[PDB]
Every structure is written in C-alpha cells, then in structure tokens.
Amino acid sequence: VMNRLILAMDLMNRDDALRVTGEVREYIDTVKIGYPLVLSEGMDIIAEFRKRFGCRIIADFKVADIPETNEKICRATFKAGADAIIVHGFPGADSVRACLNVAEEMGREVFLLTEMSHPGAEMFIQGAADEIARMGVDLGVKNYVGPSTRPERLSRLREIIGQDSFLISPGVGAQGGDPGETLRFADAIIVGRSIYLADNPAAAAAGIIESIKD
Amino acid sequence: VMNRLILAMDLMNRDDALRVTGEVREYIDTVKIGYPLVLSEGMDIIAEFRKRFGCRIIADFKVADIPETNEKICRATFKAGADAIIVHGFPGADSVRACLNVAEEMGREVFLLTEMSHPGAEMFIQGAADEIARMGVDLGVKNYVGPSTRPERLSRLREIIGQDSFLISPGVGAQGGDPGETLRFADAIIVGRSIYLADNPAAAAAGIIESIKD
Numbered sequence: 356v357m358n359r360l361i362l363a364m365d366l367m368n369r370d371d372a373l374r375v376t377g378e379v380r381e382y383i384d385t386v387k388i389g390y391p392l393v394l395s396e397g398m399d400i401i402a403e404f405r406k407r408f409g410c411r412i413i414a415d416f417k418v419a420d421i422p423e424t425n426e427k428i429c430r431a432t433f434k435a436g437a438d439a440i441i442v443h444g445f446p447g448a449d450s451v452r453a454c455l456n457v458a459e460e461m462g463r464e465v466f467l468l469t470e471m472s473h474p475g476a477e478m479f480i481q482g483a484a485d486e487i488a489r490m491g492v493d494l495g496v497k498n499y500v501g502p503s504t505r506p507e508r509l510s511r512l513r514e515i516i517g518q519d520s521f522l523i524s525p526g527v528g529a530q531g532g533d534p535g536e537t538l539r540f541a542d543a544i545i546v547g548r549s550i551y552l553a554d555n556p557a558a559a560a561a562g563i564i565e566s567i568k569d
Numbered sequence: 570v571m572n573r574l575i576l577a578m579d580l581m582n583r584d585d586a587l588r589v590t591g592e593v594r595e596y597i598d599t600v601k602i603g604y605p606l607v608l609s610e611g612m613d614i615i616a617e618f619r620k621r622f623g624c625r626i627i628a629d630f631k632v633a634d635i636p637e638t639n640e641k642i643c644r645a646t647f648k649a650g651a652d653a654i655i656v657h658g659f660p661g662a663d664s665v666r667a668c669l670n671v672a673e674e675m676g677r678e679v680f681l682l683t684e685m686s687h688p689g690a691e692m693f694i695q696g697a698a699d700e701i702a703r704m705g706v707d708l709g710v711k712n713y714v715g716p717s718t719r720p721e722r723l724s725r726l727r728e729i730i731g732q733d734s735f736l737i738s739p740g741v742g743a744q745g746g747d748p749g750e751t752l753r754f755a756d757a758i759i760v761g762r763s764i765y766l767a768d769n770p771a772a773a774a775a776g777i778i779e780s781i782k783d
C-alpha cells in the first residue's frame with residue numbers, strides 16, 4: 356500500500372469523511388472503512404470512495420457469525436465494491452472458510468484478525484491468538500491483522516505466518532502504538548484518529564510518512 | 570417475547586423480508602435483524618420494521634471491536650431505532666462496557682454472546698464461554714445469547730447467569746436445535762430459515778408455537 360499507510364476512516368458523516376480522505380489522498384491509496392461510517396451513511400459510501408479517490412477499500416466489518424451468515428455478509432460487502440474484508444478468527448475455522456469461499460467466488464481478499472490492540476484483548480483473544488494464526492495458515496489465509504500496541508505479539512505473529520504473508524497493524528497513534536516499531540513486523544500500519552481528528556490531517560499523514568521513510 | 574419466539578429475519582431483500590415478517594407477525598412480536606438485511610437494504614429498514622409491524626427489534630450486529638469503535642456502532646444502531654444490540658464477549662470487558670455505556674445513555678439493552686451454535690464454536694469460544702458469561706454477570710449484563718445446538722452448554726450458562734437473567738437461543742431448526750429442549754433453559758428461541766425459507770412461513774411459525782405451548 357502506498358507509503359505503508361492505511362487510513363482508518365471512522366468519521367460518521369459523509370461530508371467530513373470525504374473532506375479528510377481527499378486531504379490525505381496524496382499520502383494514502385488504501386482506506387479502511389468500518390461500521391461507524393457504513394452504518395451512518397450506507398453501503399453506497401464504499402463505491403463512492405472507490406469512484407472518487409481511486410483507492411482500495413478494506414471493509415473492516417470484523418465478521419464474526421456462523422458460516423451461513425458470514426457468507427451473506429461477505430457477499431453483500433463485495434457487491435458493494437470492497438476489495439477486502441476483515442474477519443474474526445475466534446469463531447473458528449468453518450466461519451473463516453465461509454468468508455474465504457465467497458472471496459474466491461468474487462475475486463476478493465480476506466484479512467484474518469489475530470490478537471487485538473486494546474486492553475481487553477488480554478482477557479480471551481491473546482491466549483487463543485497463536486492458534487488462530489496457525490488456523491489461518493492451515494486454511495491458506497494470506498492476509499492478517501495484528502496489534503501495534505504489542506510488538507512482541509506482532510513479532511510472534513509474523514513468526515507464525517511467515518514473510519510472504521501480508522500483515523497490517525492498527526493501534527498506531529491514539530492507542531499508543533509507534534509507526535516505526537510496528538513496521539519492523541507489519542507490512543503496513545493502520546491510522547485513524549491521529550490523522551482524522553488532527554487539526555491538519557494532511558500534515559499528520561505527512562509527519563507519519565516522514566517518520567517511516569527514515 | 571410473544572410466544573417465546575423471535576424471528577431471525579436474514580432475507581436480503583426488502584420485499585421478501587417485509588412479506589415474510591407480515592405473514593408471521595401474529596405469532597411473533599420480536600424480530601432479530603442482522604447484517605444480511607441491513608447491509609443489503611440500509612439501516613432505515615430497522616425503523617421501517619418498527620413502524621409497520623410494531624415489533625421490538627434486536628440488532629444482531631455481533632459487535633466485536635475496540636471500545637471506541639464499539640461505542641460508535643452502538644450509537645448508530647440505537648439512533649436507527651433498535652431496541653437492543655447483540656455484542657460479542659470474546660474481545661473483553663472494556664469492549665462490552667463500551668456497549669453497556671451507550672445502552673445506558675440511550676435507554677436500550679445489550680445482549681451478550683456466550684458460546685455459539687455452529688461447529689467451529691468448539692475451537693475457541695466454547696473454552697472461554699463460562700468465563701465470558703461470568704464477566705457478563707460481573708459487568709451487570711442481564712441479557713444473554715447461548716446455543717440451542719448444545720443444551721448441556723445452555724444449562725451450564727443458565728447456571729452461571731441465574732434465573733433472573735434473560736436468555737435467548739439461536740440454532741433452532743436449520744442448525745439442528747429443538748424448540749422444546751432449548752426452552753428448558755432459554756427464555757426465548759430464535760428461528761430463521763425454518764420459518765423464512767418455508768413454503769408457508771405462517772404455518773412453520775404456528776407449528777413451532779404449538780410444539781411449545783405443550
């Protein structure tokens with residue numbers, strides 16, 4: 356991804372979301388769109404962003420249901436124009452396979468969520484994370500998400516998934532993660548509030564990019 | 570809930586979803602609406618269903634993100650008119666508390682997802698489920714979801730949450746669960762495909778209701 360930086364666009368109104376994305380588009384060609392924006396403005400926002408910024412879109416929908424429902428969610432998301440979808444591994448292999456099957460049908464990509472970045476991740480996810488990642492490998496998953504806030508965990512994850520898997524990492528900035536340290540292990544970093552709540556988002560994005568071209 | 574039966578409306582087009590819901594409304598006053606319908610037809614479908622059927626709406630959005638994002642998702646969902654939202658416990662206590670905080674603000678309800686009904690639930694969720702339920706109790710969660718397909722697990726869950734907590738249970742019919750057995754432990758059963766894919770959904774709902782008035 357351009358500059359190894361993915362914008363997490365979690366503003367909840369279309370005008371603000373369009374403005375910030377336009378302001379930072381010269382620094383970022385991949386945008387992660389989640390339920391805060393989609394549930395506020397509708398699924399058509401995905402095609403609109405694709406048409407107007409010519410950016411890749413990762414739908415961060417944390418898909419976490421039974422296989423049959425996961426199938427439906429993925430089909431609707433790809434129909435809406437998303438390039439990739441983010442899915443939870445905690446619900447098990449059949450749930451993940453359901454998403455992979457639809458991605459195969461539609462010529463799209465699935466990212467598998469291993470350990471999460473927030474404090475509560477320590478309670479249940481952290482203990483299962485290595486096994487979730489190994490499940491991913493055994494299902495043929497090639498794209499993974501792991502936590503900027505715990506680089507020792509991001510190292511262990513990289514160790515499991517190998518160097519050819521693609522790894523993106525949220526929790527940079529607002530949640531306490533560091534761009535440079537995270538990029539020792541991840542291929543790209545995801546950044547939301549540090550950019551979109553900044554007084555000057557373009558300056559925020561530019562600062563991040565200069566701190567990692569080093 | 571009327572007749573202890575909640576319709577899971579996972580058809581993905583508004584015309585079919587409206588038709589089936591109208592056909593079964595005399596048997597069911599609570600409808601569970603999930604992402605298959607919302608991502609296909611928009612969040613406005615929730616208010617439309619509320620206006621036209623005068624039914625309670627549980628938004629089955631399996632909320633499973635970090636606290637800040639969970640907050641946003643819950644706010645958008647309640648703004649859309651949902652009476653309750655279903656949230657995952659696996660991401661930990663802070664993620665769940667974020668949902669509870671918004672529900673408190675908005676005068677709404679959170680249901681906590683313990684163990685899931687599908688085969689893959691055995692991999693990671695089942696081993697954490699008792700602890701997720703105990704976390705729920707310690708956070709003051711009063712509404713829970715547990716699996717029709719494993720009544721021994723539904724019994725253990727009821728044991729943890731006590732008799733005053735409200736417990737709803739999916740996996741009835743299509744996934745193999747039995748209405749009567751499930752209702753030994755759950756307060757209400759959730760039924761999707763057994764009703765909405767039936768040649769006569771009203772007859773399907775009626776058959777279920779006669780098999781549990783007994």
Ligand SMILES: NC(=O)c1[nH]nc([C@@H]2O[C@H](COP(=O)(O)O)[C@@H](O)[C@H]2O)c1O
Nearest residue numbers: 363471472525529530546547548634638
């Ligand atoms: N899997 C994880 O560890 C994880 N941590 N955060 C996110 C998501 O990534 C984004 C982080 O945003 P900001 O903190 O503002 O930079 C936001 O959309 C959040 O919901 C995520 O998927």
Ligand SMILES: NC(=O)c1[nH]nc([C@@H]2O[C@H](COP(=O)(O)O)[C@@H](O)[C@H]2O)c1O
Nearest residue numbers: 420424577685686739743744760761762
């Ligand atoms: N937590 C769980 O154990 C669990 N199992 N199924 C569902 C959801 O409940 C519904 C079950 O639908 P049908 O099988 O057709 O009767 C459907 O929306 C599915 O996604 C669920 O939340």
